[PDB]
Design a binder for this molecule. Sequence first.
Ligand code: A1EHF
Ligand code: A1EHF
Length: 147
Amino acid sequence: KLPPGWEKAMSRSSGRVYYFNHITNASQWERPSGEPARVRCSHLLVKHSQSRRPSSWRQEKITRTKEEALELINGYIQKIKSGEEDFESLASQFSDCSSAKARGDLGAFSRGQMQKPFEDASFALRTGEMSGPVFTDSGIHIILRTE
Ligand SMILES: Cc1csc(C(N)=O)c1
Ligand SMILES: Cc1csc(C(N)=O)c1
């Protein structure tokens, strides 16, 4: 029916159908459009106190809870989707990954290199597409597939 990971859902607040991807946690009103050796992705990471290292260039000791990290991620996604902020700008300012200094760009990678939920979401995104919150042992990610 739909591309890998996508399913129909019902808006609780509006009653309109929408589409949700259970690999990428992307959600959108529009029906999804229409695998490679490598993809290229950027990401914005928000770490939390349960991260496998709760420390970053932004903060020596990351103390925010997982729930607080998710609320930050949710807010960044809202600003990206509304156009108020660009993904690259938010990643440079707020990603707890050292790749923040490269606007979140991780370069290209194959399957079997990244943490699995990140890999699966990255490969389920089409070029240009953005994930919803993706959970790994590092923290919570917004992933943007660029190639
Ligand atoms: C909403 C929510 C996200 S993480 C979380 C928890 N209890 O760790 C709750
Ligand atoms: C992919 C990447 C670019 S900068 C960086 C770092 N400095 O750790 C990671």
